[PDB]
Symmetry: C3
Subunit: 116 residues, 3 copies
Amino acid sequence: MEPTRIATNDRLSAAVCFDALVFLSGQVPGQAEDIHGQTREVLAKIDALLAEAGSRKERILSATIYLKDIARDFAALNEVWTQWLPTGQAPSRTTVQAELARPSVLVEITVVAARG
Amino acid sequence: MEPTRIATNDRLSAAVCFDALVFLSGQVPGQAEDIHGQTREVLAKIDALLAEAGSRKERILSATIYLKDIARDFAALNEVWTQWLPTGQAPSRTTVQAELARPSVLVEITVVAARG
Amino acid sequence: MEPTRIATNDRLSAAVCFDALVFLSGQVPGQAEDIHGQTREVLAKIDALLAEAGSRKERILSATIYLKDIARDFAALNEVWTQWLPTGQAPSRTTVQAELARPSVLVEITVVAARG
């Protein structure tokens, strides 16, 4: 087996697929400025990438959720997250505080999923 | 193949199993307040989840260890960790500083393991 | 299937291999003191470990890149990273800020790869 790549540039591929596994690059928000909208936009991008990479939201295996300010933003994160997930099909997850590459980014999520 | 889930709520599943792989949610301490006891309790929970998910401590593949204060607590973390691991069967690991969802949490560990 | 281990000590194995997957411990620099040289040395070590673990740079699936100061050092990190990667074969990646176990460490990278 060979890895296949999705949306490759000279730093990263949005997705790498290998042996029924899908490895997504950490996804960042669009132009939203607030935690609620940024979380929605991050999840929208993951939704799209899963489709391109041959998976779907129901097949997420793990998610690391990085919050620039975990004390300030965890509740809002959980609100959008819990509403976006398919019912009863939540993945394994870890949420931790970390500054992201751009100061405006409040949230970034890194997903591994099962090809479907 | 379909992913199977263990102890699912509307945010996360404690474990997700797919194709001989086990993805655990980041595990946090019980009611211990000190680094030594918190690390022991985190490892106890991982021990339990591996059992439920069809793996065991000898079959851990990777561990990300998050410490709220890596300078202050790394030595104690290593002490409990090295004693808990089955001899000669340490997994791949990465230990980094990150604040966790609750301020009382000094340590959180995210494990991927092989089904056995 | 059984996991096999590479360069095991009582805290971690440099690599764990299981079912065509390679899990590397987070790699830290040698004695370089600057971000550019530290990033080069981290990538050199990963290069070596991939060889020992039966993979290669072209087969990296995911990389988490930890920077002690993401604002200060991301540009230099990207410079060395983009030059080291095999052309058109970048993996999935996530770059976040986190303090590492030693204060001198500016960068640490955790890789999962496909056995080849």
